[PDB]
Enzyme design. Structure first.
Site, short mmCIF file in Angstrom:
data_model
loop_
_atom_site.label_atom_id
_atom_site.label_comp_id
_atom_site.label_asym_id
_atom_site.label_seq_id
_atom_site.Cartn_x
_atom_site.Cartn_y
_atom_site.Cartn_z
N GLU A 1 0.75 -1.18 0.00
CA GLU A 1 0.09 -0.22 -0.04
C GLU A 1 0.99 1.24 0.02
O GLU A 1 1.37 1.73 0.90
CB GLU A 1 -1.00 0.03 1.17
N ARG B 1 0.97 10.23 0.69
CA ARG B 1 1.58 11.13 1.54
C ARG B 1 2.70 11.86 1.16
O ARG B 1 3.42 12.23 2.00
CB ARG B 1 1.62 10.50 2.80
N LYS C 1 -11.43 -1.44 6.24
CA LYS C 1 -10.07 -1.25 7.07
C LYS C 1 -10.73 -0.82 8.32
O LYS C 1 -11.67 0.01 8.17
CB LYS C 1 -9.63 0.00 6.32
#
Lengths: 213, 213, 213
Positions: C45, C49, C133
């Site tokens: 993943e 960011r 999640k």
């Protein structure tokens, strides 16, 4: 925020502490405000938790120009309209809903809404907001929770409130994601129900000094 | 609320404990309901977690009219319609969504939906609700969490469930914002499965007895 | 979902651990990636960011075909569209919003959105998602929260992330409702800049070996 002439960011960076005020007797509104200002606290959150709340906001707005007065516990568009007409400079809600976000966005004053989860924050971000209240701070998981929740969002800033005291507000102010905190210890009921304004001022000064690293 | 002949408040003020029921064998539904009623507990939440759930509600409504039977784990408008058609007197949901809230308000029976945050609370309030479920109670931080969340809302009342037992239910029932609690200990799967209704009646009676404040 | 050749389930069931990656320097991506795969960790993943994020996804998807490359911290239909075109095989979000959920079902890659409360889970389920999640895991109420949720939703599966490490990831993996874990301990920042891929492979390797129950 296009329609807001006063940015939520400016409200939250005016000082390290924004007092969460509960005024029961309208007569104590102004003196209390002037007292806080005397102690170096200029942004006052008057919570819509009492009959005189809006009147208190209107009074402080006309009589204490050295203070930026706003409303707290704003839960819906109706109340937002009310505090806006009364002269509030900003609005604080304990949480958020789309009807509140939408009316605030289209409104004239900044709204700093509280959130507890990332989905709530994302919803707020969908409306263009970047400054939020983290409430109830302690119940949400304190500093650790805020850190994790602020993790994936570098541009977001918070104003943690709820369970914040002289004992731990430094822990929050230390976080880079935090601009200021909210506390109710500056305007204690007992002290306000005794006209002890000198006490309020001193609590503000201590609050401000106790924040400076 | 406008379209609800029976208020949500009425449902929660009926008794201190609302059993969260999971019935796997339809044939046990009626004797179980009678046993709980015999123990002084008549607000029965039949969760939609088993195939015979709907038939259970129907059977109970028919054969045990003295009980206030309703549905739990109602997740959307379709299920809400289905249980209302089957005779459920109320509906419980572990959480809320706008589609469920709108359909409930348009419907004929009270919905007491669960929330975990202030934003979720406010959403429900947007639709006029004032009674909510706090789920999962313990995992959300227990009594402390609830008191913080209930702070800004004086007129709201809760029915916390999730990890509540004889060991701690008085901790919740003691709170001003709590009307009652939900628990699954009154109808243990083994007892129900074994058709041991004497045990169920005893558990219900002990539950009611221990809730006295 | 109707338009996902690779189900969310498939992604989450590939391995026991999913590294949440933050790549500051492009050109660090591939070596890091290969390093993870060498240790037995295929699902990577890459969080949005950093500036090079999207480039790292494309670079990894080109030079490491076996790795199942995806994007993290996807917050809106814009970033989703972006990563999808850049070759992300899946998308992960910290939380969920209706706009994001809608665009996902219209898109082509699976979206595994984060949720913290049952109300958020229900919103996601209203869009047909079954895999979620659980973030931030610890703050959300950790293992016990998840178990509380399994009651009303026994078919839903989760990938908890946030505060999970070799010291506790097994506590989560043991749960029936958990398919895999999300973590950042597989790629320590310092190790990356230090060019210590060996350390990364060892961490990844220990991660998989340690998960075997």
């Amino acid at each position: 925020m296009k329609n807001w002439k006063t940015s939520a960011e400016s409200i939250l960076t005016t000082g390290p502490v924004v007092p969460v005020i509960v005024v029961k007797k309208l007569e104590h509104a102004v003196p209390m405000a002037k007292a806080l200002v005397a102690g170096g606290v200029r942004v006052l959150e008057v919570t819509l938790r009492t009959e005189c709340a809006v009147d208190a906001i209107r009074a402080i707005a006309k009589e204490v120009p050295e203070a930026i007065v706003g409303a707290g516990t704003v839960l819906n568009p109706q109340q937002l309209a009310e505090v806006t007409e009364a002269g509030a400079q900003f609005a604080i809600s304990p949480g958020l809903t789309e009807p509140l976000l939408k009316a605030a966005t289209e409104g004239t004053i900044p709204l700093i809404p509280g959130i507890s989860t990332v989905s709530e924050l994302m919803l707020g971000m969908d409306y263009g907001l970047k400054e939020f209240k983290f409430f109830p701070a302690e119940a949400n998981g304190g500093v650790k929770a805020l850190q994790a929740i602020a993790g994936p969002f570098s541009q977001v800033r918070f104003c943690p409130t709820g369970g914040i005291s002289p004992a731990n507000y430094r822990d929050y102010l230390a976080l880079k994601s935090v601009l200021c905190i909210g506390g109710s210890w500056l305007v204690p009921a007992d002290a306000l129900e005794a006209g002890d304004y000198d006490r309020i001022t001193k609590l503000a000064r201590e609050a401000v000094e106790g924040a400076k690293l």
